[PDB]
Amino acid sequence: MEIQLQQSGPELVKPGASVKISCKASGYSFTDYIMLWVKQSHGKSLEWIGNINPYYGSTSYNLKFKGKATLTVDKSSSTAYMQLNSLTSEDSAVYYCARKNYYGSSLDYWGQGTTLTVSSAKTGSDVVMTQTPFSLPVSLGDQASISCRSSQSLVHSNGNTYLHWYLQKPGQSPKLLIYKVSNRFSGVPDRFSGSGSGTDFTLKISRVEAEDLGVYFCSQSTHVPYTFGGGTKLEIK
Ligand SMILES: OC[C@H]1O[C@H](OC[C@H]2O[C@H](O)[C@@H](O)[C@@H](O)[C@@H]2O)[C@@H](O)[C@@H](O)[C@@H]1O
Numbered sequence: 001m002e003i004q005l006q007q008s009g010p011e012l013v014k015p016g017a018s019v020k021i022s023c024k025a026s027g028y029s030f031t032d033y034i035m036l037w038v039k040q041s042h043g044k045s046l047e048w049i050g051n052i053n054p055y056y057g058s059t060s061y062n063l064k065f066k067g068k069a070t071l072t073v074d075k076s077s078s079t080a081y082m083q084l085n086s087l088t089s090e091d092s093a094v095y096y097c098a099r100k101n102y103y104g105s106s107l108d109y110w111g112q113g114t115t116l117t118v119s120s121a122k123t124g125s126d127v128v129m130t131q132t133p134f135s136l137p138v139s140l141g142d143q144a145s146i147s148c149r150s151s152q153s154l155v156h157s158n159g160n161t162y163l164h165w166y167l168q169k170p171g172q173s174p175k176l177l178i179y180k181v182s183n184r185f186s187g188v189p190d191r192f193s194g195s196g197s198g199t200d201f202t203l204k205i206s207r208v209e210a211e212d213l214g215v216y217f218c219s220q221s222t223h224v225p226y227t228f229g230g231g232t233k234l235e236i237k
């Protein structure tokens with residue numbers, strides 16, 4: 001098959017109300033993978049909301065969202081839900097669900113996103129990921145190099161380093177490119193290569209083409225809460 005996460009449609013909701021966004025999983029065994037939710041404010045970086053293990057219904061939240069977001073599942077319909085309460089204009093954003101694997105601790109399949117608009121109208125410190133440059137204008141064909149530095153070592157107890165790279169093309173959800181520093185995800189071209197160790201990581205693109213354009217995000221999942229870099233927009237001069 002093919003794996004799909006299908007989210008409910010755009011929501012226009014009044015301030016103070018609640019909203020419950022759905023994410024229907026197909027193509028894989030729903031209870032065998034953590035489902036994670038992400039907020040993306042129109043400004044652009046990704047923020048972890050929380051995880052749910054659908055087999056148990058057990059949850060973990062980013063402290064920022066604890067008290068605001070509630071994650072549930074319906075196993076019978078292979079559907080994950082995120083409810084947001086006491087909505088204000090600051091909740092207006094795009095929300096993604098994404099499947100998290102165990103072998104890579106990476107977000108391998110993403111929903112298409114749900115846009116929430118909140119309006120009255122009718123129609124241990126967290127680990128910081130510093131990405132540079134924030135903007136990389138290039139000529140087509142150029143080599144491109146993007147750096148990601150973490151405030152703490154990303155080496156996990158098991159000796160692996162859970163640093164990953166995602167590409168979000170214009171108007172799409174993020175997609176996994178590289179997991180665990182240097183491993184190319186299925187279908188990703190050899191022109192992408194990831195390197196680095198400890199706190200310093202690099203993504204290189206050997207010959208940029210149009211399908212590579214968008215915003216790149218590094219992410220770490222060695223430490224809780226999971227965190228993302230601020231993005232690097234790769235675009236043509
Ligand atoms: O760590 C030893 C166990 O490794 C596997 O289970 C470990 C975790 O791997 C899975 O991806 C998840 O299902 C986890 O819940 C699981 O604990 C298994 O091979 C297990 O038989 C080993 O004991």
Ligand SMILES: OC[C@H]1O[C@H](OC[C@H]2O[C@H](O)[C@@H](O)[C@@H](O)[C@@H]2O)[C@@H](O)[C@@H](O)[C@@H]1O
Pocket residue numbers: 153154155156157158222223224
């Ligand atoms: O060997 C390096 C460190 O490995 C473990 O901690 C690394 C990361 O593993 C955990 O999953 C999280 O607690 C992270 O916060 C943690 O740094 C530890 O054994 C640590 O003592 C080692 O220094």
